[model samples]
Target chain A: MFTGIITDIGKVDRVKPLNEGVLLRIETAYDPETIELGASIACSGVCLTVVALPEKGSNARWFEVEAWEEALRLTTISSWQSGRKINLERSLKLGDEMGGHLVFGHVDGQAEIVERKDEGDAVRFTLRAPEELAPFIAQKGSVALDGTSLTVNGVNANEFDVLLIRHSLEVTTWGERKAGDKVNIEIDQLARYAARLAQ
Target chain B: MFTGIITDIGKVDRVKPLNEGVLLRIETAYDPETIELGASIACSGVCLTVVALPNARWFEVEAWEEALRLTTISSWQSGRKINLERSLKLGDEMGGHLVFGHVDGQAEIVERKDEGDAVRFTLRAPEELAPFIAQKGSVALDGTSLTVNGVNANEFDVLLIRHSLEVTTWGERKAGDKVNIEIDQLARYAARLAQYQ
Candidate 1:
């Protein structure tokens, strides 16, 4: 389990196929001691277990995870490549802070950025989810795009607007976000449950 | 930010009344280095700020009246087992849906049954929150992200797999208990969109 909160932005060092899945090596600045082999880590909203650990004292600590084809096909993992910057979050520890909402590391689907604009000091991003996932978003609700939890400012059909504050732009990859970019999206759990009850 | 994942089953050590809320001391086995003073932690889906770090194995968090009125925190007693999660760091990974730790309201467990290797729980959400749930969609109940198996009116059922039970406090949950409910973000936004049209 992880918080949708991002701790670091990791660069994809390598992506290679292994049997039915691909092996991903992500270079991060996390201490090697904190990473345990076989532990689960969220790589851009995908829960991937650590298959390989990095050595200590290395300037660049790169760990490896095996992303099965199913995971790649369902989310944004297929778009990953060498040098791609991905959001990273370690699994929740016993006493870690829960700043963001609960993210299952399971991407329900993907959303496409339809428009972007500067709204005062913040950047307003308009995005559209799949038709089936459209009902899962709401104005003032929350959404995790590529692992960063953001608040929805407005809604229109299958499209929604999220205002990324300067802090988010500086702290997350959203600073470089633009129209036509596809991102992994996990709808709010409450909205989903509420919809289920209504149905 | 949280992953909506419960990493520790914390036990309430003490509860003290405050002017506008209550102070909760939770005991856990987590290392002390992970907790800092005034940090945010999710206690059973309620995002609370740590007011005191009494010791290595315990921390005190304050829940305002607003949280108490909307969530089950007011009912928390000594020795109650609560789900626990810490704030997300910049480099941390997101495992579940985006859980803001801001609980919308409370849901009551209406039924419980054993289903093969899993436990099926039927819960009733408030009328206002019911529209956000959908079949196969997700809901965070007491900080645990669960999939909706079925829904009827304000009621819905979720099957807690063995893995989820083992990792969360849900294994000990029973009927008549109230849980904090966080509606899925997608469902909320989608429903709002229809209102505009």
Candidate 2:
């Protein structure tokens, strides 16, 4: 549902519990007029649908989305709270731009950053993919890390690395990330199904 | 143009900025099969022309930069409800004041106090639209007719009786949320011809 291109960075303003889910209000500078009710937004690789928005006559700038128990378990959403900044991207529309891989905003699992170091002109990030997602990892293939599209530099079993250039470092949350941090990882949708068919 | 009487409140389903102006696909109750392309409908008092009658009770329109600067449509987002009034017809009864669905500028509530069962709201108008607003005159807010009870500089007051609040989306309108302002056509036209005045 997304092209893995980061559009905006939104901060969690408030977190509250709903019946069986958690509701998060995101403080964003996105054009209020452009946000639609019930729109699916990819927040750091986990797609969440907007359930509420700022009331008319309020100068407040925010929108709300919900993550149920399952989503909280699948991504890093469980740790989201006030002051946490997340990568934001709107769903792909007609005549929109696309890139290395098609990301559905469905996190396969959370990956731990094993190493973060500079590799010449680019920043190299080594990550440990979840056991189930390891099969989809391949050298030269693409993956979405924290909603940023990146190519696989090398794969060693369940571990892999992606190199991010200067432009990506400035636009996304990658620069602020460090070793031992958790990032939501979404496998390439096309690859996921291709291997499923092979199975 | 419209009568400023809202018939439905449409929800926005998607949006994207354009070299083609900003595109919006709003979800409404109207059936798309009957809605012909190129029809104009008022969305929150801005009469926007529809380009696509897409699926899921949606209507697509692109509002330009100039229009965005003049109206409260700039505050729209997904899950935001907008006032909707379809085009008028030959036999339709005149239920409200004559309205053109052309917004001049947005207004902010100066104060809201209870007048018995009625709610009195004083709003400060933008400089461009202020001169056209007057006491004892008709004005439209979010496509609904209302009477201006008082005027002070760029500020004017309107009272929404119990029935008014019960009928529309204004109940949720508080202090800072901007409201679309449409000056009464008569007053707007009262000025001398463009060259003369």
Candidate 3:
């Protein structure tokens, strides 16, 4: 439901942790006009809900949102801290040209960032799927990391590799990432689906 | 979402033309206690809802379902009526399963049946894409249509077309085999989920 490209990392207006989830506020660092209430937006590859809107008179508008700690625990956000570039994608619309697989905004498990290497202008991040989600992954398929949509370079049932273009790394704040960084991931919707039907 | 084999063919319980879409009530002539409300059941490869209870006290049920005229206008009213089938049945009952590519009915003007007529007498229905339905077989590929082609033994495998596959199966079976089939809607899993082995 999102493109991992970081158009502009919104400014963190507020971060309030709750027992069930964490609430954060952001003002679009780029074009705030495109931000609409009830629209699906991904921050650092973590899809969060827009709970509040910023006032126009404010220099920085605040968009209040909430994400559970479990969801954050799987991604780089918990360690990356706040105020970093994040990926974004709007949900698919009818005939808008399908970009990624069907994502339910559900985080099954976290993948450990195994290796980060430079692939020309692009970058490849090898992440380990916790065994459960490995079967759904296929080479050249798509996966969502920390909310950014990525392409699979290689998969071996335990973990797979994700390749990001230079444009994605530069714009989405992925350049500073390193091995051992935990990232939130949503397997290809097809993967989640195959698992569901098998039972 | 799964396809059940045509155990028996029933009748078109009712067909009412709605304002936007058409509503169909098909009674599958088979009985399964698993048939419950809000359950996703495949009726001849087409997924329909268990809208109301069956009209009879025996093994019968009603599916409150709607379809765009483009999808159902061709297949629903004609030939034989079938009931909803699920994919889980394949593993427990048949052991292995076959692929879902066959004809249920022919299109009228713009009809969508399971099987043949012109250059494309039978058309493939829209898959919910729970997984990418491979042109052949990847995994979790299920639809709600009666199988006129491909027979399975112990392991279920979806047979891709080689052009020859289609030619051989044509006119081999009709009516009963023309029901729609929906594949399993999830990723193939093992115990506790394994590596994508």
Candidate 4:
């Protein structure tokens, strides 16, 4: 399990394809000793299990995880390539504080960044969700974009807006995001169940 | 913090009231040495703090009145199977969506049925939270991340596969039962943003 809080930003060091899934080598700041083989990790909102441990004598610590074809088709992970940056969060443990909402490293679907603008030192981003997902989003609620928890500043039709504070830009990979870029999105759990009851 | 993922199906061993809240004893498969005093754990989507480590398999947590008022924890009884997850760490891998353990409210199971190899659950949430649910969206019920299969006026259904049933407590859930609920963050913020606009 994870909180949507991003602890580190990793870069895609390599992408290799297997028979049923694709293997991604991600360069991160986490100590190689902490990551266990087969441990589950959320790579930009998609839960993937680590397949390889970091090798010795490497310039940076890099771990490998596999993304099956089904996950590739469902989320934005299919577009990942070498040099791409992603938000990272480790699994929860005993005695840890709950900073963000509970994030089940589950990406429901994809969202398209339809608009991006600069407002002072912050950036306002508008993302268009699939029509079916539109109703679940609400103003003042939260969303996990590429594994980072962000607040909704506004909403219009099938699109919603988030104002990324300067700290978010500096600490996360969102700094590199632009209009037209796609991202993995996990909607809030509360909105999902509440919408159902209202329906 | 939770991953919105269920790592263990915990059984409620005891439930006692405190001056401030209720104390619950939960038995799980986790090692006792690993569970420290003052640990944050998600008990069926409501984040609670571990107050006592009685043994290797059981731990005690407290749920205050507010948590009980807004969630299904009030109905939890001895021998009840509940979902469980430890708080998130800085270096461990994340397997689920970020869950703060703050349950927004409770959802009642309206329907339960079998569909093919999966079990289907239909639940109803409060009106205020309904706008945030969307078809194909995600929700955490009893700390399990379930995909919304369909949505109607004030209710939605989720299809739980065999693996999900075996790993979590959903297999034991039934109609008319209440479960702790945390809505999707995106949906909550989107609706809030729209209202402002």
The numbered model that scores best in TM-score is 1
- Better model by lDDT: candidate 1 vs candidate 2: 1
After superposition, which runs of candidate 4 have C-alpha atoms over 4 Å from their true positions? A56-60, A195-199, B1-197
Best by lDDT: 1
Give one digit per residue, the lDDT tens place, for model 1 in A22-112: 9999998787678889988888888999998866566668899999877888898888899998888888866455566667788878899
* Alpha carbon deviation, residue A64, candidate 4 (Å): 0.4
TM-score, candidate number 1: 0.56
Q: Give lDDT tens digits, candidate 2, residues A56-134.
A: 8888878899999889998999999799999999887753434334688888889999999997789999999887677
B-chain TM-score of model 2: 0.90
In candidate 1 chain B, where is summed lDDT lowest over 10 consecutive residues?
B188-197
Candidate 1 residue lDDT tens string, B1-197: 67787788899999999899898889987776677776888899988888778546998888887898999998999999989987776556667777767789999998989998799999999999988889888888998888898988899999888988887889998999889999876565565646744
What lDDT does each candidate get? 0.83, 0.80, 0.50, 0.82
TM-score of each: 0.56, 0.50, 0.50, 0.52
Best-to-worst ranking by TM-score: 1, 4, 3, 2
Q: Which stretches of candidate 2 lie over 4 Å from their true place?
A: B1-197
- iRMS, candidate 2, in Å: value is 27.8
Residues B40-106 of candidate 3: C-alpha lDDT, one tens digit per residue: 4544444444555553522322322233332333355634444334433212343224322222222
lDDT of 3 by residue, A72-177 (tens): 6665555434565455555545433222334545666677888888878677788888765676666545677766667777765577888877766676656677
Ranked by lDDT from best down, the candidates are 1, 4, 2, 3
Candidate 4 per-residue C-alpha lDDT over B97-196 given as tens digits, one digit per residue, 9 for 90 to 100:
6566668898999999998778999999988878777898888888887788899977999889898889888888889888888887656545554554
Candidate 4 residue A67 C-alpha distance from true site, Å: 0.2
- Stretches of model 1 off by over 4 angstroms after superposition: A55-60, A194-199, B1-197
Model 3 clash tally? 46
